[PDB]
């Protein structure tokens with residue numbers, strides 16, 4: 001049994017005991033995870049700016 | 065509550081998962097490994113991506 | 126209302142066709158962004174005219190006048206309705222213009238002439254000169270970077286004499302090529318890997334990306350087009366088109 005999942009989760013499991021799984025081949029597509037809010041939410045604009053600010057400062061890479 | 069990411073039920077038309085909690089106003093924001101897709105963006109808003117990824121294959125060594 | 130599209134002659138996004146002389150209007154161009162424009166215009170139901178950014182720049186804000194140049198400036202001052210180009214979604218730009226979700230992922234990388242293996246290596250020597258493109262997001266990345274190595278690299282670049290900065294990507298690439306390995310160029314992975322697969326096959330991308338960002342289709346704040354184009358980008362990515370165009374212009378055309 002082989003499992004189709006997002007590269008992020010695959011890479012995480014590949015580093016966990018019992019270290020018996022592995023990610024193979026290239027990614028099938030390219031996409032992203034985003035912080036979601038209800039349509040027309042007040043928070044939308046500010047959280048988008050926060051995500052951009054935090055990626056630019058190196059925090060997102062640091063956290064991964 | 066339902067431990068799901070979010071999908072619209074073809075028969076019932078209801079959105080489940082985190083997406084549903086946002087759509088029906090149970091939550092104000094979803095901070096999770098929630099993929100930005102076209103069908104979701106039609107009902108909720110997404111920030112630019114905080115993480116880049118792609119579907120891949122996991123095998124037993 | 127014919128949509129004025131601002132773009133930039135940057136391979137392989139927008140390039141003049143071999144036979145441009147006998148061609149007119151949108152027909153004179155070809156590339157990833159030319160096919161992308163045709164595609165989103167198809168899905169959004171609009172007619173358009175491709176125009177090359179007058180000043181040949183991506184977009185930066187002059188600290189003295191506060192005036193935006195490049196494609197950003199053309200959008201900000203209403204000279205163009207939409208920018209379909211390899212334009213990087215950044216915080217400063219997002220404050221003055223709208224960006225669709227990314228149509229392409231990328232990161233800053235190093236281009237060497239066929240002794241440097243990474244950013245850290247450039248920051249430890251003075252023999253090999255290195256710089257970036259003027260008026261772009263790569264130069265800003267280093268200007269606003271606190272990460273020790275990137276901060277240290279900027280301090281060297283900022284003060285560099287002669288200037289290690291270039292007007293166009295083509296200028297940076299040509300400089301690496303004629304410098305006998307004494308100049309490395311910092312540019313986006315997308316453009317780096319394209320050139321890597323083009324004659325004279327004398328360059329190469331080294332190390333991993335310095336960051337993870339994306340290019341987005343830009344429109345002026347409050348634009349009626351914004352909503353539709355964003356959904357169009359998502360549709361095209363999901364239909365598999367973006368991947369198809371990427372392989373079409375990068376590797377089916379690779380000559381190395």
Ligand SMILES: N[C@@H](CCC(=O)O)C(=O)O
Pocket residue numbers: 183184211212213258260261262263264311312313
């Ligand atoms: N894509 C960059 C230009 C290229 C670069 O700065 O390396 C921008 O949108 O400014």
